[PDB]
Design a protein. Structure first.
Length: 248
């Protein structure tokens, strides 16, 4: 895929899926800016902007500054997110609020600050990273899954709001991935994954393909949806999970 000459923004670009996605865009020729709360890695091969996406005023100031100096924003990737686990009646007030502020509010702020640019330029692509938890109820993750379902709903209506401007808006819903989330077990056994096997007593299916996701496999799906090869695709959500939701 040739993204040479295209301007690409990626949130959550400090690590994990967002970093792998920004890197893939760089490797495909794009002019990339990454946004995150922290950039703790040693090297980032793209422009970095420190930003709390859950701070509406900070998002306004940063996006307005950057938008004043670009002719078009070809691709926006929303990939910020946090996980706070807990049974619904055990979850703290702070974990509930921060889950929604980051996981939905973040994209909301980005949309509020970029939709006018998309309408003015008339075209471009948005890809939003949701979660398989937006597709199925998950013991221990009720708030997380609910925040991701809200994000998916918001992104789809934004897609409808921008479709008349020729803008395409899609999502990717990763399953278990080698990075972030619950990547490490509570014992010294990771190895042959428990995640691949499933956990039937909590109505959690295993993974039919027999492996968890690599970040590159999420990134490459994002790049496809961001590309002219997806030029008739909008309002779709590609689950990238080895079949674990069985297509849900």
């Amino acid at each position: 895929l040739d993204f040479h000459g295209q301007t690409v923004w990626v949130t959550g670009a400090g690590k994990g899926i967002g970093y792998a996605t920004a890197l893939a865009f760089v490797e495909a020729g794009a002019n990339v800016t990454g946004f995150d709360l922290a950039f703790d890695g040693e090297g980032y091969p793209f422009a970095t902007e420190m930003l709390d996406v859950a701070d509406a005023d900070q998002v306004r100031d940063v996006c307005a500054r950057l938008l004043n100096d670009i002719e078009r924003l070809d691709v926006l990737v929303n990939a910020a997110g946090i996980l706070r686990m807990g049974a619904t009646d055990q979850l703290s007030a702070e974990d509930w609020q921060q889950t929604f502020a980051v996981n939905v509010g973040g994209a909301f702020n980005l949309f509020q600050q970029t939709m006018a640019q998309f309408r003015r330029q008339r075209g471009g692509a948005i890809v939003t990273v949701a979660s398989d938890a937006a597709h199925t109820p998950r013991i221990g993750m009720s708030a997380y899954g609910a925040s991701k379902a809200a994000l998916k709903s918001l992104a789809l209506t934004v897609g409808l709001e921008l479709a008349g401007s020729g803008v395409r808006c899609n999502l990717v819903s990763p399953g278990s991935t080698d990075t972030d989330m619950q990547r490490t077990l509570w014992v010294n056994e990771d190895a042959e994954q428990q995640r691949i096997r499933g956990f039937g007593e909590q109505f959690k299916l295993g993974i039919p393909l027999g492996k968890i996701a690599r970040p590159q496999e999420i990134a490459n799906t994002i790049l496809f949806l961001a590309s002219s090869h997806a030029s008739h695709i909008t309002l779709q959500d590609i689950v990238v999970d080895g079949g674990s939701t069985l297509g849900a």
